[PDB]
C-alpha cells in the first residue's frame, strides 16, 4: 500500500470480499481463502501483463517514424 499509494483499509477490505451488484442493489460478499489467493495471483498477472504492454507501447513510440508506411 505504501509503494502503490492505495490506502491500506481499502486493499485489506477488497482482498477479502467481492462485490455483486444488480442495477438496483449491491452486496459485499466474503470469499474463501483459496478464492482470495486466486484473485491476488490474477491481479499480479494482470499488472504484469499491462506493464509489458505499456513498455512495448513505448518501444513502439521510439521505433515509429512519421512517414506513412506503404508496405512492410
Amino acid at each position: 500500500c505504501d509503494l502503490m499509494g492505495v490506502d491500506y483499509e481499502e486493499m485489506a477490505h477488497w482482498l477479502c470480499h467481492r462485490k455483486l451488484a444488480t442495477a438496483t442493489e449491491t452486496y459485499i460478499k466474503p470469499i474463501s481463502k483459496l478464492h482470495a489467493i486466486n484473485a491476488r495471483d490474477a491481479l499480479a498477472k494482470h499488472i504484469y501483463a499491462n506493464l509489458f504492454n505499456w513498455i512495448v507501447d513505448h518501444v513502439n513510440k521510439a521505433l515509429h517514424s512519421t512517414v506513412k508506411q506503404h508496405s512492410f
Partner: protein
Amino acid sequence: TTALVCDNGSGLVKAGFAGDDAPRAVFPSIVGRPRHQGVMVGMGQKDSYVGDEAQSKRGILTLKYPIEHGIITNWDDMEKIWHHTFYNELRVAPEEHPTLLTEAPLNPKANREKMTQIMFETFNVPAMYVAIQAVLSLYASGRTTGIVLDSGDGVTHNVPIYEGYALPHAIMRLDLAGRDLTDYLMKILTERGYSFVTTAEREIVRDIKEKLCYVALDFENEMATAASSSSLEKSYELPDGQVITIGNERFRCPETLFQPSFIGMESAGIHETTYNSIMKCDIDIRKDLYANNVMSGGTTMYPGIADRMQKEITALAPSTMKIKIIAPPERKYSVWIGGSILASLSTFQQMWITKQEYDEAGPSIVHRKCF
C-alpha cells in the same frame, strides 16, 4: 450465442444472459387491468400493464398474479409477461438464443408441457431447458452436496443432494410462502386497527413485511418482552404519509413458517421438514447433509432466520453431529446465478431440447430429457 436465462416465480421475474454476474431484468410479475371508467379523451388508454408499469399505476388497477404456488394459472397473462421480458425489458429477439427456464420440483407435468409448447411455437426459441430451483442453488453456492431449503413467494421445498445425485423420495414440498405470510400479516395487522383490503394495499403490506419483520430467536421470551415494553415497537409511513405503528406482531408474522398452526395448517415448520427430509435419506450421507444447509429465495431473508434454524435443528439433531447453516447474502438471486452457471457450461450444450426434437416428439419430450 449466449443463452437466455429466465427464472419465473410467483413474485419477481428474474431474467438475464448466461455468463452474466447478476440478472439484467428484475421486476415483480403482475398483470394489471384498469377498473375505473376512463374520462379523458385521447389519454392513450391501454388494455393492460405488466411489471413495473402495473406497480406504478397500481392504485388504478386490479393486480393479478399469473403464478400461484409455482403453477401458471392463466396462460395468457404469463405469455404477456414473457413477451414483456424478451421484447421490452431485455430487448433481444428469442429467435437467436437458447433459453433456460426454472420450476419448483414436484409440479404438474402440464406446466412444463405448456411452457415448452409456448416457447417453441409462440417465440420460436431455437432450444430450451427446464431446471429445478434447488439444484441451481447448489451451483450458485459452489457445492455438490447439501440439503437445499429454498422458499420464495409460493412454494417452499427442500431437496437433498449428495455428490450430484438427487434423492427423489426425500424431496419435500410445502405451500408456506411470502404470500401466505403476507395474508397472515394483513389478518394479524387488523388487530391494531389497520385494514388492508385491496390488492394494491396488499403490496403495501408486502413492503411492510420486507422492511420491518424479523424472526424471533425465542418466541415466548420476545412475546413477554413486547408485552412488557414499547422498546420492540416500531413504525412505518404509508404512501399517503399517514404513520402506522406495529408491535410484537412484526416478529409474530415470520414465525408461522416455524408454526404453520398459526395460519391453520398442521404440517410442521421448515426446521422439522428439513430434519424429516434428512431422515428420509440413507444413514451414511446424513453427516454431510447436516454439514451443509443452503438457503435460497427471498422468504429466507428475514433477520435471524438463519440462527433460529441452526438452533432449532441443533435441538432436533443428535448432539454430537455438527449442524451448519449456509445463508449467503445474495441468496435471493442464487437460483438465477445457478442457472447462469449451468447454462454457461460446455457439457450442458449437449443437453438442450432442440426444435427438431420437439417437432419429432411433441411437447412431451421435456419429461424425457429434462428430469
